[PDB]
Tab-separated table of C-alpha atoms and ligand atoms in Angstrom:
chain	number	residue	atom	x	y	z
H	270	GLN	CA	-66.040	-4.593	-78.531
H	271	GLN	CA	-65.913	-4.956	-74.757
H	272	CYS	CA	-63.452	-3.482	-72.272
H	273	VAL	CA	-61.461	-4.555	-69.255
H	274	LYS	CA	-61.304	-2.400	-66.126
H	275	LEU	CA	-57.737	-1.536	-65.124
H	276	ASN	CA	-56.640	-1.388	-61.458
H	277	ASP	CA	-56.743	2.296	-62.403
H	278	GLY	CA	-60.501	2.382	-62.755
H	279	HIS	CA	-59.831	3.121	-66.419
H	280	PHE	CA	-61.187	0.867	-69.138
H	281	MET	CA	-59.083	-0.809	-71.808
H	282	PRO	CA	-60.650	-2.255	-74.953
H	283	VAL	CA	-59.727	-5.941	-75.033
H	284	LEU	CA	-58.974	-5.701	-78.757
H	285	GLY	CA	-56.051	-3.504	-79.741
H	286	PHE	CA	-54.510	-2.540	-83.083
H	287	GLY	CA	-50.779	-3.124	-83.523
H	288	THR	CA	-49.149	-0.259	-85.428
H	289	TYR	CA	-45.578	-1.533	-85.736
H	290	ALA	CA	-44.266	-2.262	-89.248
H	291	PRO	CA	-40.626	-2.693	-90.336
H	292	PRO	CA	-38.676	0.356	-91.614
H	293	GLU	CA	-39.039	-0.958	-95.161
H	294	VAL	CA	-42.752	-0.163	-95.009
H	295	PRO	CA	-43.428	3.474	-95.989
H	296	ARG	CA	-44.172	5.715	-92.991
H	297	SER	CA	-47.269	6.768	-94.929
H	298	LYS	CA	-48.951	3.372	-94.430
H	299	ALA	CA	-49.274	3.758	-90.639
H	300	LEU	CA	-51.581	6.723	-91.206
H	301	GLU	CA	-53.878	4.824	-93.590
H	302	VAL	CA	-54.045	1.510	-91.723
H	303	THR	CA	-54.732	3.077	-88.324
H	304	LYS	CA	-57.663	4.960	-89.877
H	305	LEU	CA	-58.837	1.740	-91.521
H	306	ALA	CA	-58.460	0.053	-88.151
H	307	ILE	CA	-60.614	2.721	-86.489
H	308	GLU	CA	-63.272	2.495	-89.170
H	309	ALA	CA	-63.240	-1.301	-88.860
H	310	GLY	CA	-63.982	-1.117	-85.134
H	311	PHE	CA	-60.618	-0.932	-83.332
H	312	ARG	CA	-60.695	1.519	-80.416
H	313	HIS	CA	-57.387	0.545	-78.830
H	314	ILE	CA	-54.212	1.565	-80.724
H	315	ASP	CA	-50.706	0.470	-79.719
H	316	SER	CA	-47.721	2.625	-80.683
H	317	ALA	CA	-44.227	3.393	-79.393
H	318	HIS	CA	-41.275	5.744	-79.795
H	319	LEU	CA	-39.423	2.767	-81.288
H	320	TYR	CA	-41.976	2.452	-84.107
H	321	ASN	CA	-41.142	5.921	-85.534
H	322	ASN	CA	-44.819	6.327	-86.485
H	323	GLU	CA	-46.364	8.432	-83.702
H	324	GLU	CA	-46.957	11.425	-85.973
H	325	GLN	CA	-48.917	9.221	-88.405
H	326	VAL	CA	-50.808	7.234	-85.812
H	327	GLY	CA	-51.635	10.383	-83.886
H	328	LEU	CA	-52.763	12.098	-87.093
H	329	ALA	CA	-54.921	9.076	-87.929
H	330	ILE	CA	-56.594	9.374	-84.514
H	331	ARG	CA	-57.199	13.118	-84.837
H	332	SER	CA	-58.480	12.699	-88.407
H	333	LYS	CA	-61.157	10.268	-87.154
H	334	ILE	CA	-62.216	12.747	-84.467
H	335	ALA	CA	-62.206	15.686	-86.869
H	336	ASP	CA	-64.451	13.838	-89.315
H	337	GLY	CA	-66.719	13.089	-86.364
H	338	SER	CA	-66.213	9.332	-86.466
H	339	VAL	CA	-65.130	9.099	-82.835
H	340	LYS	CA	-64.403	11.114	-79.715
H	341	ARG	CA	-60.956	11.242	-78.053
H	342	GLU	CA	-62.495	9.467	-75.084
H	343	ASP	CA	-63.617	6.621	-77.388
H	344	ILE	CA	-60.035	5.782	-78.354
H	345	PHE	CA	-57.545	4.108	-76.016
H	346	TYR	CA	-54.100	5.191	-77.191
H	347	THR	CA	-50.773	3.907	-75.903
H	348	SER	CA	-47.152	4.744	-76.521
H	349	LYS	CA	-43.975	3.590	-74.825
H	350	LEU	CA	-40.694	4.808	-73.339
H	351	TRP	CA	-37.672	3.392	-75.197
H	352	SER	CA	-34.843	1.658	-73.283
H	353	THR	CA	-32.455	4.505	-73.995
H	354	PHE	CA	-34.692	6.801	-71.924
H	355	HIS	CA	-34.898	4.744	-68.728
H	356	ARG	CA	-32.849	7.285	-66.769
H	357	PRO	CA	-35.376	9.227	-64.589
H	358	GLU	CA	-34.656	12.716	-65.885
H	359	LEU	CA	-35.308	11.476	-69.428
H	360	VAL	CA	-38.768	10.003	-68.805
H	361	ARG	CA	-41.171	12.982	-68.761
H	362	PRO	CA	-39.258	14.663	-71.595
H	363	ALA	CA	-39.767	11.471	-73.636
H	364	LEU	CA	-43.519	11.415	-72.956
H	365	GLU	CA	-43.915	15.096	-73.833
H	366	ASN	CA	-42.166	14.606	-77.174
H	367	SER	CA	-44.356	11.578	-77.877
H	368	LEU	CA	-47.407	13.709	-77.042
H	369	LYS	CA	-46.114	16.467	-79.306
H	370	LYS	CA	-45.519	14.018	-82.164
H	371	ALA	CA	-49.070	12.658	-81.896
H	372	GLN	CA	-50.454	16.119	-81.160
H	373	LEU	CA	-52.381	14.756	-78.157
H	374	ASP	CA	-52.757	16.228	-74.662
H	375	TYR	CA	-52.572	12.861	-72.959
H	376	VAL	CA	-51.759	9.281	-73.729
H	377	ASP	CA	-54.248	6.670	-72.432
H	378	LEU	CA	-51.329	4.457	-71.508
H	379	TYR	CA	-47.565	4.874	-71.296
H	380	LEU	CA	-45.352	1.845	-70.756
H	381	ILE	CA	-41.733	1.072	-70.033
H	382	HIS	CA	-41.193	-0.770	-73.337
H	383	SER	CA	-38.590	-3.178	-71.928
H	384	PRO	CA	-36.775	-3.702	-68.586
H	385	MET	CA	-33.490	-3.855	-70.492
H	386	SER	CA	-31.891	-0.396	-70.303
H	387	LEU	CA	-29.745	0.896	-73.189
H	388	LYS	CA	-27.047	3.539	-73.537
H	389	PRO	CA	-28.714	7.000	-73.576
H	390	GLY	CA	-28.243	9.108	-76.692
H	391	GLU	CA	-29.637	9.644	-80.180
H	392	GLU	CA	-29.513	6.066	-81.441
H	393	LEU	CA	-32.476	3.769	-80.842
H	394	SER	CA	-30.050	0.854	-80.929
H	395	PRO	CA	-26.620	2.073	-79.758
H	396	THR	CA	-23.958	-0.407	-80.817
H	397	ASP	CA	-20.179	-0.729	-80.578
H	398	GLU	CA	-17.648	-1.285	-83.376
H	399	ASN	CA	-18.592	-4.990	-83.226
H	400	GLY	CA	-22.283	-4.376	-83.861
H	401	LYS	CA	-22.910	-5.307	-80.234
H	402	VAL	CA	-25.673	-3.405	-78.414
H	403	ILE	CA	-24.385	-1.220	-75.585
H	404	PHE	CA	-26.352	-1.698	-72.364
H	405	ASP	CA	-26.919	0.788	-69.547
H	406	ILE	CA	-27.537	0.309	-65.845
H	407	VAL	CA	-30.622	1.989	-64.358
H	408	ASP	CA	-32.676	1.388	-61.214
H	409	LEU	CA	-36.079	0.689	-62.788
H	410	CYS	CA	-37.770	1.780	-59.574
H	411	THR	CA	-36.516	5.317	-60.308
H	412	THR	CA	-37.716	4.930	-63.885
H	413	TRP	CA	-41.079	3.921	-62.447
H	414	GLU	CA	-41.202	6.855	-60.029
H	415	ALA	CA	-40.665	9.176	-62.992
H	416	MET	CA	-43.464	7.251	-64.728
H	417	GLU	CA	-45.735	7.954	-61.767
H	418	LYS	CA	-45.050	11.695	-61.947
H	419	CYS	CA	-46.292	11.705	-65.572
H	420	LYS	CA	-49.561	10.173	-64.373
H	421	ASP	CA	-49.739	12.687	-61.479
H	422	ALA	CA	-49.516	15.489	-64.053
H	423	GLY	CA	-52.232	13.998	-66.247
H	424	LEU	CA	-49.944	13.350	-69.220
H	425	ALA	CA	-50.758	9.642	-68.965
H	426	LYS	CA	-54.187	8.288	-67.995
H	427	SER	CA	-52.571	5.021	-66.948
H	428	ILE	CA	-49.035	3.685	-66.837
H	429	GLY	CA	-47.683	0.170	-66.986
H	430	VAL	CA	-44.807	-2.018	-68.075
H	431	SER	CA	-43.887	-4.390	-70.879
H	432	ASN	CA	-41.694	-7.509	-71.039
H	433	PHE	CA	-41.262	-7.709	-67.257
H	434	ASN	CA	-41.011	-11.127	-65.597
H	435	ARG	CA	-42.404	-11.925	-62.124
H	436	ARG	CA	-39.284	-10.838	-60.240
H	437	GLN	CA	-39.172	-7.500	-62.069
H	438	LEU	CA	-42.871	-6.893	-61.393
H	439	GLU	CA	-42.541	-7.765	-57.699
H	440	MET	CA	-39.691	-5.267	-57.602
H	441	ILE	CA	-42.057	-2.450	-58.578
H	442	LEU	CA	-44.927	-3.865	-56.541
H	443	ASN	CA	-42.745	-3.945	-53.411
H	444	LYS	CA	-41.201	-0.518	-53.994
H	445	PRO	CA	-41.541	1.689	-50.896
H	446	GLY	CA	-43.775	4.713	-51.335
H	447	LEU	CA	-45.241	3.180	-54.506
H	448	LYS	CA	-48.018	5.450	-55.800
H	449	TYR	CA	-49.239	3.519	-58.850
H	450	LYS	CA	-49.140	-0.202	-59.627
H	451	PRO	CA	-48.655	-0.822	-63.357
H	452	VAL	CA	-52.109	-1.433	-64.880
H	453	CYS	CA	-50.637	-3.977	-67.261
H	454	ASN	CA	-47.705	-6.015	-68.511
H	455	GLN	CA	-47.576	-6.234	-72.302
H	456	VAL	CA	-45.598	-9.383	-73.179
H	457	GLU	CA	-45.221	-11.868	-76.032
H	458	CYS	CA	-48.164	-14.196	-75.728
H	459	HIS	CA	-49.581	-16.789	-78.129
H	460	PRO	CA	-50.441	-20.519	-78.142
H	461	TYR	CA	-46.754	-21.439	-78.423
H	462	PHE	CA	-45.864	-19.183	-75.495
H	463	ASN	CA	-49.093	-18.807	-73.445
H	464	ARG	CA	-47.395	-17.466	-70.306
H	465	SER	CA	-49.779	-19.283	-67.952
H	466	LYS	CA	-47.779	-18.761	-64.749
H	467	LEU	CA	-47.069	-15.079	-65.404
H	468	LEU	CA	-50.726	-14.553	-66.390
H	469	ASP	CA	-52.003	-16.068	-63.153
H	470	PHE	CA	-49.510	-13.981	-61.174
H	471	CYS	CA	-50.556	-10.765	-62.924
H	472	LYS	CA	-54.252	-11.496	-62.255
H	473	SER	CA	-53.372	-12.052	-58.590
H	474	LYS	CA	-51.985	-8.503	-58.507
H	475	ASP	CA	-54.788	-7.031	-60.611
H	476	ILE	CA	-52.353	-6.489	-63.499
H	477	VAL	CA	-53.758	-7.249	-66.929
H	478	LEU	CA	-51.718	-9.187	-69.441
H	479	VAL	CA	-51.671	-7.648	-72.918
H	480	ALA	CA	-50.555	-10.040	-75.650
H	481	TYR	CA	-48.295	-9.099	-78.561
H	482	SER	CA	-47.137	-11.335	-81.441
H	483	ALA	CA	-50.458	-13.018	-80.696
H	484	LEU	CA	-50.781	-14.015	-84.348
H	485	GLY	CA	-47.260	-15.415	-84.359
H	486	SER	CA	-45.061	-12.406	-85.054
H	487	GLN	CA	-44.220	-10.622	-88.314
H	488	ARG	CA	-41.361	-13.123	-88.738
H	489	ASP	CA	-38.695	-10.578	-89.714
H	490	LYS	CA	-35.651	-12.654	-90.704
H	491	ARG	CA	-33.509	-10.060	-88.956
H	492	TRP	CA	-35.188	-10.601	-85.566
H	493	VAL	CA	-37.093	-13.883	-85.546
H	494	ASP	CA	-35.917	-17.266	-84.345
H	495	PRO	CA	-35.090	-18.929	-87.729
H	496	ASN	CA	-36.100	-22.333	-86.401
H	497	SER	CA	-39.485	-21.282	-85.015
H	498	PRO	CA	-42.689	-22.916	-86.353
H	499	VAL	CA	-45.302	-20.746	-88.101
H	500	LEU	CA	-48.170	-20.219	-85.648
H	501	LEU	CA	-50.847	-19.500	-88.233
H	502	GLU	CA	-49.866	-22.789	-89.844
H	503	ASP	CA	-50.565	-24.741	-86.666
H	504	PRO	CA	-52.635	-27.888	-87.445
H	505	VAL	CA	-54.752	-27.492	-84.292
H	506	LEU	CA	-55.518	-23.807	-84.878
H	507	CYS	CA	-56.340	-24.694	-88.462
H	508	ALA	CA	-58.583	-27.555	-87.334
H	509	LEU	CA	-60.319	-25.194	-84.942
H	510	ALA	CA	-60.666	-22.610	-87.700
H	511	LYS	CA	-62.496	-25.157	-89.849
H	512	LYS	CA	-64.737	-26.218	-86.981
H	513	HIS	CA	-65.728	-22.630	-86.151
H	514	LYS	CA	-65.612	-21.478	-89.788
H	515	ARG	CA	-63.062	-18.836	-88.824
H	516	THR	CA	-59.333	-18.375	-89.423
H	517	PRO	CA	-56.258	-19.524	-87.450
H	518	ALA	CA	-55.612	-15.861	-86.561
H	519	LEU	CA	-59.168	-15.407	-85.235
H	520	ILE	CA	-58.793	-18.651	-83.245
H	521	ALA	CA	-55.498	-17.446	-81.716
H	522	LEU	CA	-57.015	-14.080	-80.767
H	523	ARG	CA	-60.189	-15.556	-79.262
H	524	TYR	CA	-58.062	-17.900	-77.169
H	525	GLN	CA	-56.537	-14.866	-75.470
H	526	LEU	CA	-59.882	-13.131	-74.998
H	527	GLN	CA	-61.331	-16.138	-73.171
H	528	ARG	CA	-58.488	-16.554	-70.687
H	529	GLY	CA	-58.736	-12.884	-69.733
H	530	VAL	CA	-55.878	-11.587	-71.850
H	531	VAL	CA	-56.114	-8.303	-73.781
H	532	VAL	CA	-55.026	-9.109	-77.337
H	533	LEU	CA	-53.140	-7.005	-79.855
H	534	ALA	CA	-53.291	-7.665	-83.590
H	535	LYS	CA	-51.113	-5.985	-86.177
H	536	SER	CA	-52.162	-5.944	-89.799
H	537	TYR	CA	-51.448	-3.528	-92.607
H	538	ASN	CA	-53.909	-5.363	-94.867
H	539	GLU	CA	-57.360	-3.767	-95.118
H	540	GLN	CA	-59.196	-7.087	-95.370
H	541	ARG	CA	-57.330	-8.719	-92.477
H	542	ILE	CA	-57.862	-5.550	-90.410
H	543	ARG	CA	-61.627	-5.934	-90.790
H	544	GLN	CA	-61.510	-9.685	-90.319
H	545	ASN	CA	-59.762	-9.309	-86.961
H	546	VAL	CA	-62.654	-7.496	-85.287
H	547	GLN	CA	-64.683	-10.684	-85.899
H	548	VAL	CA	-63.024	-12.145	-82.805
H	549	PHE	CA	-66.121	-10.985	-80.938
H	550	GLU	CA	-68.508	-12.938	-83.200
H	551	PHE	CA	-67.823	-16.447	-81.910
H	552	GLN	CA	-66.515	-18.411	-78.951
H	553	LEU	CA	-64.385	-21.496	-78.338
H	554	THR	CA	-65.568	-24.344	-76.123
H	555	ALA	CA	-63.800	-25.429	-72.962
H	556	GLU	CA	-62.306	-28.379	-74.864
H	557	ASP	CA	-61.210	-26.045	-77.666
H	558	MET	CA	-59.478	-23.960	-75.013
H	559	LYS	CA	-57.931	-27.066	-73.456
H	560	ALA	CA	-56.429	-28.235	-76.754
H	561	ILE	CA	-54.939	-24.797	-77.375
H	562	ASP	CA	-53.459	-24.765	-73.859
H	563	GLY	CA	-51.525	-27.875	-74.832
H	564	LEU	CA	-49.778	-26.110	-77.745
H	565	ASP	CA	-47.514	-24.154	-75.373
H	566	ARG	CA	-43.793	-24.710	-76.015
H	567	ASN	CA	-42.217	-21.737	-74.194
H	568	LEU	CA	-41.447	-20.266	-77.589
H	569	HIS	CA	-40.651	-16.598	-78.059
H	570	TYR	CA	-40.332	-15.504	-81.652
H	571	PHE	CA	-37.924	-12.686	-80.867
H	572	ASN	CA	-34.370	-13.979	-81.344
H	573	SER	CA	-33.017	-12.381	-78.150
H	574	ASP	CA	-30.416	-14.995	-77.215
H	575	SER	CA	-27.722	-12.375	-77.883
H	576	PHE	CA	-29.146	-10.210	-75.062
H	577	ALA	CA	-29.376	-12.945	-72.448
H	578	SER	CA	-26.272	-11.337	-70.975
H	579	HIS	CA	-28.250	-8.213	-70.129
H	580	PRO	CA	-28.732	-8.350	-66.342
H	581	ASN	CA	-32.382	-7.391	-66.924
H	582	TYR	CA	-33.037	-10.013	-69.592
H	583	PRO	CA	-36.584	-11.128	-68.693
H	584	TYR	CA	-36.352	-14.673	-70.069
H	585	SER	CA	-33.652	-15.873	-67.650
H	586	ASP	CA	-36.247	-16.809	-65.013
H	587	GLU	CA	-38.961	-19.493	-65.244
H	588	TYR	CA	-41.471	-16.651	-65.594
F	26	NAP	N1	-43.783	-4.222	-76.296
F	26	NAP	C1	-43.181	-5.058	-77.111
F	26	NAP	O1	-42.100	-5.563	-76.853
F	26	NAP	C2	-43.812	-5.431	-78.456
F	26	NAP	C3	-43.123	-6.374	-79.352
F	26	NAP	C4	-43.741	-6.687	-80.590
F	26	NAP	C5	-44.985	-6.104	-80.967
F	26	NAP	N2	-45.615	-5.178	-80.052
F	26	NAP	C6	-46.921	-4.534	-80.475
F	26	NAP	O2	-47.961	-5.552	-80.678
F	26	NAP	C7	-48.343	-5.597	-82.083
F	26	NAP	C8	-48.548	-6.981	-82.629
F	26	NAP	O3	-47.341	-7.763	-82.495
F	26	NAP	P1	-46.572	-8.200	-83.808
F	26	NAP	O4	-46.003	-6.988	-84.422
F	26	NAP	O5	-45.635	-9.337	-83.583
F	26	NAP	O6	-47.719	-8.715	-84.751
F	26	NAP	P2	-48.765	-9.898	-84.795
F	26	NAP	O7	-50.087	-9.252	-84.470
F	26	NAP	O8	-48.247	-11.080	-84.235
F	26	NAP	O9	-48.721	-10.034	-86.345
F	26	NAP	C9	-49.648	-10.843	-86.995
F	26	NAP	C10	-49.042	-10.878	-88.415
F	26	NAP	O10	-50.046	-11.716	-89.076
F	26	NAP	C11	-50.729	-11.059	-90.112
F	26	NAP	N3	-52.152	-10.985	-89.834
F	26	NAP	C12	-52.928	-10.067	-89.160
F	26	NAP	N4	-54.211	-10.369	-89.125
F	26	NAP	C13	-54.265	-11.564	-89.824
F	26	NAP	C14	-55.361	-12.390	-90.133
F	26	NAP	N5	-56.651	-12.195	-89.805
F	26	NAP	N6	-55.092	-13.553	-90.869
F	26	NAP	C15	-53.782	-13.874	-91.278
F	26	NAP	N7	-52.688	-13.078	-90.986
F	26	NAP	C16	-52.985	-11.936	-90.260
F	26	NAP	C17	-50.124	-9.634	-90.243
F	26	NAP	O11	-49.664	-9.440	-91.570
F	26	NAP	P3	-50.392	-8.402	-92.587
F	26	NAP	O12	-49.944	-7.016	-92.139
F	26	NAP	O13	-49.829	-8.828	-93.887
F	26	NAP	O14	-51.893	-8.589	-92.408
F	26	NAP	C18	-49.092	-9.505	-89.147
F	26	NAP	O15	-47.780	-9.264	-89.661
F	26	NAP	C19	-47.318	-4.645	-82.805
F	26	NAP	O16	-47.853	-3.992	-83.953
F	26	NAP	C20	-46.902	-3.699	-81.713
F	26	NAP	O17	-47.809	-2.624	-81.606
F	26	NAP	C21	-45.029	-4.849	-78.808
F	27	15M	C1	-36.603	-9.984	-74.283
F	27	15M	C2	-38.014	-9.368	-74.368
F	27	15M	N1	-38.266	-8.410	-75.272
F	27	15M	C3	-38.060	-7.097	-75.008
F	27	15M	O1	-37.602	-6.709	-73.842
F	27	15M	C4	-38.369	-6.046	-76.105
F	27	15M	C5	-37.292	-6.122	-77.205
F	27	15M	C6	-37.353	-4.897	-78.155
F	27	15M	C7	-38.594	-4.856	-79.005
F	27	15M	C8	-38.809	-5.636	-80.110
F	27	15M	C9	-37.817	-6.660	-80.610
F	27	15M	C10	-37.249	-6.435	-82.055
F	27	15M	C11	-36.687	-5.014	-82.270
F	27	15M	C12	-35.242	-4.997	-81.962
F	27	15M	C13	-34.708	-3.968	-81.304
F	27	15M	C14	-33.252	-3.956	-81.012
F	27	15M	O2	-32.612	-2.957	-81.778
F	27	15M	C15	-33.028	-3.660	-79.527
F	27	15M	C16	-33.312	-4.917	-78.669
F	27	15M	C17	-32.854	-4.685	-77.261
F	27	15M	C18	-31.648	-5.302	-76.790
F	27	15M	C19	-31.201	-5.075	-75.453
F	27	15M	C20	-31.965	-4.237	-74.588
F	27	15M	C21	-33.172	-3.623	-75.053
F	27	15M	C22	-33.609	-3.848	-76.383
F	27	15M	C23	-36.928	-4.670	-83.743
F	27	15M	O3	-37.192	-3.295	-83.867
F	27	15M	C24	-38.152	-5.485	-84.171
F	27	15M	C25	-38.229	-6.702	-83.230
F	27	15M	O4	-39.552	-6.848	-82.790
C-alpha cells in the first residue's frame, strides 16, 4: 500500500475503506468491518457525521491500536462536516463532537461533505411538509476559514472539500488571506463518470482527487438513478477482469490508481474487503487504460436532479 503526498506535506494512503452503509444495516457491522478492513491491509478509513457510525469506526481504530496491530500514525482517518453545519460558528463544535464520538484527539482529514448548505438544526435532512429539503445560504469561504482554524488548533491534520466543482474550488483558492488550500476534493468518480477535466484541474492546483462510488455505488433504490447501468456489469471491465484474472471491481479501482486518483472502496463483506487490497498486485496497460477512458458517460449514480435548484448544486457546470 503506497501513499500520496498532500499539498500539506502529509501522506494519504491511495487505498481507502468506505464505511458508509444504509440505516437498515445494523450499526454493529461498522465496528466489525472496519476492523476486518484494517486487518486486511486498509490504512485509510473514510467516515462522516452523516454515516452515524463514528463511534463504531473510531472504536474499531482504537481496538486495532490497543491489540498492537497498528499505531495511530499508521491509520489515516477522515470524517466530514454535514451541510447543516456549514455556518462558521458550527464548524469547530461539529469537529469536536466527531472527535469525541470516535474518541480520537485529531482527525487525519476533515472535509466539507458537500457545497450545498442545509437548514441548521437537529435533522440531518431537514424537510418541509412536502418532503422537500430545506436549503440554507452560507458563504463557503467563511465555512472554510472556520475549517482552517480547526487545522491551526491541531484538531485536523489536513482539511479539504468534497463534491466541489471547478468554480467552487477556485472560489476557495482565490479567497483573500487564504491560509490552507484544501488537500483534496472527494467526488464521485468511476469509469462512467471519470471526471477528467476536474481531475486535471485539481492536479494543476496540487489538489488530489479522491474517488467515491468507484465500484459503481451501493445502488440504493431510494437514492440511485433508476435508469443507470450497473458498473460492475460493464462488458469492458469484465473483459479486462478476464484478461488480468481479476474482478471488475479490482479493474475499476486500479484504473483510478494509475491516473493518480486516490480510490475509496466500501464493502461490508469480509471476502470482498480482502479482495480489494489486491489492487496493488497487478497493473493495466496503456491500452487497457485507454479503453476504460472511453467508458465515460458523465453519469453520476446519485439521483440529485431534485436538488439542481440548490444554488450550490455542483453538477450545473461542465465541471
Ligand atoms: N462525500 C460523498 O459525497 C460520498 C458519497 C458516497 C460515498 N462516499 C464514501 O465513499 C465510500 C464508497 O462509495 P460508495 O458508498 O458508493 O461505495 P462503492 O465503493 O461504490 O461500493 C461498491 C459496492 O460494491 C460492492 N463491492 C465492494 N468490493 C467489491 C468487490 N471486490 N467485488 C464486487 N463488489 C464489491 C460493495 O458491496 P458489499 O458491501 O456487498 O461488498 C459496495 O456496496 C463510502 O463508503 C463513503 O465512505 C462519500
Ligand atoms: C450533488 C453531489 N453530491 C453531494 O453534494 C453529496 C450529497 C449527499 C451525500 C450522499 C447522497 C445520498 C444521501 C442523501 C442525503 C440527503 O438526505 C441530502 C442530500 C442533499 C440535498 C441538498 C443539499 C445537501 C445534501 C443518502 O444518505 C445516501 C446517498 O448517498
